[PDB]
Design an enzyme around this catalytic site. Sequence first.
Site, short mmCIF file in Angstrom:
data_model
loop_
_atom_site.label_atom_id
_atom_site.label_comp_id
_atom_site.label_asym_id
_atom_site.label_seq_id
_atom_site.Cartn_x
_atom_site.Cartn_y
_atom_site.Cartn_z
N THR A 159 -2.95 1.69 -5.96
CA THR A 159 -3.06 0.19 -5.99
C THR A 159 -2.23 -0.48 -6.97
O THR A 159 -3.45 -0.55 -7.43
CB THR A 159 -3.64 -0.13 -4.76
OG1 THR A 159 -4.57 0.50 -3.53
CG2 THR A 159 -3.57 -1.56 -3.93
N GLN A 160 -1.66 -1.38 -6.81
CA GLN A 160 -1.21 -2.23 -7.60
C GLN A 160 -0.43 -3.55 -7.30
O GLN A 160 -0.46 -4.26 -6.55
CB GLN A 160 0.77 -1.41 -8.88
CG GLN A 160 0.11 -0.31 -8.96
CD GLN A 160 1.46 -0.12 -9.84
OE1 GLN A 160 2.25 -0.61 -10.57
NE2 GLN A 160 1.75 1.25 -10.63
N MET B 19 -0.61 7.00 -2.97
CA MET B 19 -0.93 5.27 -3.39
C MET B 19 -1.03 4.83 -4.06
O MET B 19 -2.21 4.05 -4.76
CB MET B 19 -2.66 5.20 -2.29
CG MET B 19 -2.51 5.95 -1.30
SD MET B 19 -1.21 4.42 -0.09
CE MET B 19 -2.40 3.18 0.25
#
Lengths: 244, 233, 231, 240, 222, 235, 250, 218
Positions: free
Chosen positions: B1-2, B107
């Site tokens: 997740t970024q 992810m």
Amino acid sequence: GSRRYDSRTTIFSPEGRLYQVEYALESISHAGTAIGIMASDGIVLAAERKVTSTLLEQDTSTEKLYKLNDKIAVAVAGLTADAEILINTARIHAQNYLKTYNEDIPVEILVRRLSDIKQGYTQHGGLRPFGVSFIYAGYDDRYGYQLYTSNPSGNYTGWKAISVGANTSAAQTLLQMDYKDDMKVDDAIELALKTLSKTTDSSALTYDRLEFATIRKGANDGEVYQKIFKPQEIKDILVKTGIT
Amino acid sequence: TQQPIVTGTSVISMKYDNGVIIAADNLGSYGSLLRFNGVERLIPVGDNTVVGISGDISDMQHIERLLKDLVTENAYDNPLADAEEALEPSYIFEYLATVMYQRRSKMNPLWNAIIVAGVQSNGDQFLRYVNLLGVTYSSPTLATGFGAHMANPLLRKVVDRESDIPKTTVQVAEEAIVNAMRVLYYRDARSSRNFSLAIIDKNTGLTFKKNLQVENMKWDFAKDIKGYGTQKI
Amino acid sequence: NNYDGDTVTFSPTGRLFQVEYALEAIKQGSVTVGLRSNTHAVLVALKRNADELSSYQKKIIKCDEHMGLSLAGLAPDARVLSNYLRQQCNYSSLVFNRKLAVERAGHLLCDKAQKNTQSYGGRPYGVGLLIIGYDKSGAHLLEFQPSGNVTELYGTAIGARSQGAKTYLERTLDTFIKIDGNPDELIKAGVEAISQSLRDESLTVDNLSIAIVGKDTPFTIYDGEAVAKYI
Amino acid sequence: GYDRALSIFSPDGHIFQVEYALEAVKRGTCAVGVKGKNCVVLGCERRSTLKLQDTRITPSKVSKIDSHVVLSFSGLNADSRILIEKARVEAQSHRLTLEDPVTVEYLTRYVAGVQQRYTQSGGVRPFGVSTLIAGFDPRDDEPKLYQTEPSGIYSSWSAQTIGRNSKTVREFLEKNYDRKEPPATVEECVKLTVRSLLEVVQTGAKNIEITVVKPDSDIVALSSEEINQYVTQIEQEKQE
Amino acid sequence: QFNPYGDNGGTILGIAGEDFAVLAGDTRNITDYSINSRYEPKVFDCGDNIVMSANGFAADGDALVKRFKNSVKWYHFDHNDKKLSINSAARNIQHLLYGKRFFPYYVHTIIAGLDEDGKGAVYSFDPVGSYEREQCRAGGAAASLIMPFLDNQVNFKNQYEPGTNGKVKKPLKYLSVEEVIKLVRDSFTSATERHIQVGDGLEILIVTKDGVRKEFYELKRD
Amino acid sequence: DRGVSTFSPEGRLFQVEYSLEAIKLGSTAIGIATKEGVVLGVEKRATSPLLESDSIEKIVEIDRHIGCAMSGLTADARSMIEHARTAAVTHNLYYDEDINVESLTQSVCDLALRFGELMSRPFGVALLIAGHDADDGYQLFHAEPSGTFYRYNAKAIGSGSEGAQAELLNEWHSSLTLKEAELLVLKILKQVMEEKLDENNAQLSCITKQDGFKIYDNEKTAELIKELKEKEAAE
Amino acid sequence: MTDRYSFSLTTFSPSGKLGQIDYALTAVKQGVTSLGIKATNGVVIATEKKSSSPLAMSETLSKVSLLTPDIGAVYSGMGPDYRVLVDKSRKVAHTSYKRIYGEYPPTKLLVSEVAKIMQEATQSGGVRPFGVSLLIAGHDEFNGFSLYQVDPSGSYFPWKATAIGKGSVAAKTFLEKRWNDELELEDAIHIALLTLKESVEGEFNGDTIELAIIGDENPDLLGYTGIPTDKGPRFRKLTSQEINDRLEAL
Amino acid sequence: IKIATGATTLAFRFQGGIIVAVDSRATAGNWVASQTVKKVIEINPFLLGTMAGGAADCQFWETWLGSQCRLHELREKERISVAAASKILSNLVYQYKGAGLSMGTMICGYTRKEGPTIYYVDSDGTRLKGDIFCVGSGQTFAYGVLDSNYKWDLSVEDALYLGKRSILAAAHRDAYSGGSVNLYHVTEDGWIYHGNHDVGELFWKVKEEEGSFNNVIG
Ligand SMILES: [Mg+2]
């Protein structure tokens, strides 16, 4: 590679024997004799210290007799360092059992597990076996007073009276002669000492060259007491039986 | 997740009769702040491919390093590295598309939208898109971000289908791209006036144009606009 | 003698005996021939049987639409190495949308065989391979040896009595190299080449095995009645 | 981890470590299994060089694997405990997953598989043990008797013996046991088992152990006096 | 927060005849209200007379097809170039999809071809691997528009024999390849009118014993 | 000592060659393939008369369409059979079909050379794998511990293999019926066996497309033995 | 690559001997003489500083080592083996005791932990035994003063007084004549110096002799004040000057 | 995605073995995806399983179950018990508990030692032996017809009708149940298929012949 230097500790001989186990037993046969005698009202453990020096601290010493828990003790014959590894494992196992079931570990269960560890070193891992033989003396509410022995093979057996270490052949003959089933603790104490006195390689048996312990129900009402004898207490019991 | 930090906006491109054209502005935005002005977002691979990248600039610099390392690796034990066994646009694209999809499936995406423009060994034009999701598609015109909404409509007036490609010259195609970059400067709040443009032709090869500016802009009519309805002065 | 117990040991003269013993397994294997022109590449293989009741051991394996090999020696080792080649060809296609170069195929096999000759416990591969293929730089023929050494050639042969076919191809070099755009004639030259390695036995319908790859020809294997044309 | 291949082939096609494990079985005390019409009896030798023993607490030669199956053995005593433990665990695991106790054949196949695994696993030696496994399948009245050995091969037997001087007692059983008519009753089966051990043992005092297994988890061990009665009866009939 | 899924729109349609089978799909690719491509094929020849389409999230769709094509390749290597039957392919695809049961491929998969008796076969899959053989199946964005029309025209549902008091149903029968293509074209032109994600072009793949043939038709581009 | 995966100067793996000597000590197993089916037969060889011969399991089912006979260190075959059964069922799960006999044999042979310093030694057992599939029809394979497998029209393995193989060379032809093949296995088994052949010390089996893999009863085999003796005395 | 020596290098011979342990003891025999004597109010441990070269600074090489504030150690045999044992002994005193009980371990238990480490080198894979014998002197509240010997096997014994190494046979005989149960610490130091002179051949002074004591608490060596219960280390290494003072009245 | 679909499945023990009856409808929200879904899984010729909850979860793992049952009888040379077969499946899904499997199935079989046996197996680990089970969105409607008309001494003909009529009751009332009815009869010698029955035609037929559904004009 490293194959060149492997002794192959866990293999059979052409005759179907385990080389390293047999050679470990040969090592144990030179160790100080240890005797265990089981009576109707208690158990005796007697052991001979290996050629004592006069400057050895005798009172604060432990070579032969070790406590596993409040109800079980062992006499050692062989490499002391090896025995202490196994003893700590046995102490831990006893506490695991108490933690799990809220009951003191039955003697045989402790003996079987310790013997199973020895067996492992003879079948896998490529390591040398433990050069140790034990005499287990203990009590539980199922079988009462019990004597066992285990050796480097990981095989264990139960006994009324037994010796390990040096001169077991001569010692076992003397025990077989004078032992009887309706025997008391005080009589067993006398038999243990008399046997060591005759089988010893020393000139004369003295207090400083011995370790002694009893497991009686001599405490107050239906409870077991472990007595590891002090030097002065061994001196007294040796005079009382007329050896010195 | 970024979450993307320093970002690059639209990349636009199209096919013409003998090759492909691709363009992108030289801006690295930091949210609403127009922080960095000397950012090259078109990266050539060999003499037959140009990769145009939008989105996160840190992830773009990572992809630059991968492409640079790809050229090195291809040259190893390869006597025909500058000939038959040289890197093709289709090879470079499929590698990136594999990476983008693998990263989304963990992810942990590369927060980018990429267009790979080039010419194959047999002369065929190559133009394909890939993004952070691993989604891929090809079209006579391709654009990212605002370019998709504003540039594609203008470029599709020139090349509306496959049959319009042979009819479109490099002069006409370049004119449409330059016009599109002006429209984006009018209407995209995270765009700059300065941009780079690259042409990959099957005959004249790779032409890389730097330090271009949007010009011939219409602003004069602004003086006549007063108030927001009723105001006369 | 004292230096052949494992692959990790050098002899006093600098030899690796286990690798040489692995090389010996190839010499015992049945003969197989490889040759190419500019347009096509051909494998010819003499298959071997246990007895008249048994089948004939398959010598040729397909690796991709444009690449494949023939084996001589331990067949299971060829299965391991061919499987590795199939994966590498396949990795090249999925990741780079690119047909694997025959030269890179050789480099990958060399490096895989090498690791088995420098470490304790493992053993060298006991098989030799002839890899053919058609890629972006035309037709190719490679010879793999389990020492790690890979060599690109116009023609060659490995296995028992392979010297006869190898001598023939050395004489015929100028002729068969120019057989362009003619599959059947290139095969004929390969069948005549392998015939120089025959003793007492001759080429029959269920004995001969042929494979071909080229410009407009995928890697395909011919067995049974399909090779009756060339006898 | 210790990886050495201890069990390997020799030029003549033998695995010496497995064959030397059989020599350990040949050294072990004699064990005999005889199955009748409605029962199986397991007889076991106990060497008499060991006096001053405590028979209450000393490990018994016959072991219960489940309430309906028993296991005796010949060879290394320490090794046998490992096989017995694994077998007991598998017996409970079978009940848990299949909701039914193990068949005697299944239990034998498992134990034999464990023995085999140790003949081609790195870093381990084979078990110096041969077992006799006997009992009755759930809801079945047909007697079962199986034998296993270090190599891992197993098979079913009408009657069988293992251990030291087993070739002598096998000779006895081969002429005395009739396939067409096995021991019809419990007494007949026990007697034949005791008779066969009396060819080898020495004295019929505290040297012979007998365990009788009957259908529906009915297992009991005989005492000294009970066994001594068979010994007294056989000797009187012998003097003829 | 990062969302690993997307919707690329489009719709697909598989019909099975007596000795043939068709797998159709529109060529439009979209995200939200934008058109990405007017011609991006999503119906593929996978070999062994099997055609396949995986509609929905295009990245997952391309990955699945790519893995199945690869599965076909290895089936040949491991089983002596044996032809992969349509039923075997279907079961294999179930295991591909269910392998990601807890992080699914966001696609509706349809395959078509001929069964081992030579008869037309269509199989359809949900995103996690449940599958079923059917005569008729529409998938994707406009599935809800097309499918009830197929029920009525292919399987003759709700149609009774005239004059029989609604007692005798209209009899089932196999359609010709010409009649099936008519239904496909009319299905897609109707869906194009009423669904915004459907249009641009129509590509049909027809499968017979002779091989795999293609047909292309223009659709409305608005 | 010496490494497990070592080559001899002649170019053979010592341990593989030594395992082949163990297989020669094993009991005889014969297989014959026909257009009507494949027949498998074995010598049980009980070590003692007290041993219940019906518990000797040297013929084994892998799937409905594939059977297996063994010879050598038979305990080693258990994990090979377990793998074969799993491979067969797993393929049916993945592909909704029967698995090819050749592919099954290849799967078993992949285990063979997975030994060294993986298991500690090669297998000391050879297998005859018989079966049927739609593509190649009735098949017989000989799987060795070398990792090699040959297809055979007929094959014998075990102690009396070289003598039995020479006999199969003369007797086999392409038009053999199933009944003829059954008798031929019994005939050749009786020749090479030490003890006299009967229904208790020998076992027959077959695999047909229609009925699949079947092990014959002792009653059925006994009649085929009686039929065999009468036919030899008839000329 | 990787450590392929996962098997024991020490094994039982047919006679029952553990060869590598015996050979390790032989290495200890070759080693320089060290000794220990227990008094009523303290313990002394001493050894000769065998210098490898006169250019070498023998102060930098410490044969007598502090393990805890109340426990010290000296050895005979292989110096490098001793140095790493001291490191491990110091660490195990913390990890397996002080970090659990918030106090330093008693002498017997620390000795037990060192013995365990040495036993493992006798049985574990791919290692040889340690080629040293240790003498560990220490004090703790409930056991008082104590002196232990530890051998390569892992065996340990408590001693009133003893010696190990080169001239241990003669040195033990000397200690038997002089030792009694009423010895004060200063008397024990005096006897230690007499015993050690017999085995030493060359120079005999504070620079060639290393000697430490376990005696009274040393508040001056603590390094801080303010906590009444913390009274300082009982281990103290005697200086070169302090030794020479006692050599005059010898 | 949408795995939560509607259904009506039942299975009951009786004198002549086991009846299994299911509907055929699959729904994705309000959208009817299929009317021709096979909700009875033929594990092997002797064992049946019902589909309710996740279609994939039921298909995949009950096919997998058939593979385990085949391996059991190859090793033990004996038919697997229904108890053992059901427990293999329940133990398996219990390992996956919490991950999100969705399953509600009846494992049905007829053996010698057990007789006709039904086990309800469920994705949260439940394993229940019983005589009558009904699972799905329309289970309540089917239970009502079952409970009021069930007897142990039902004939095979009447038992087949009861299972058919119970599914029809649910198909009528439950919106997410319908399409067609699939019938099965499980005997000791194996299961027997008793056809596919369109609910559209079946309803009107039952209405007329039985006199039920007077609320509906026909
Ligand atoms: Mg539209």
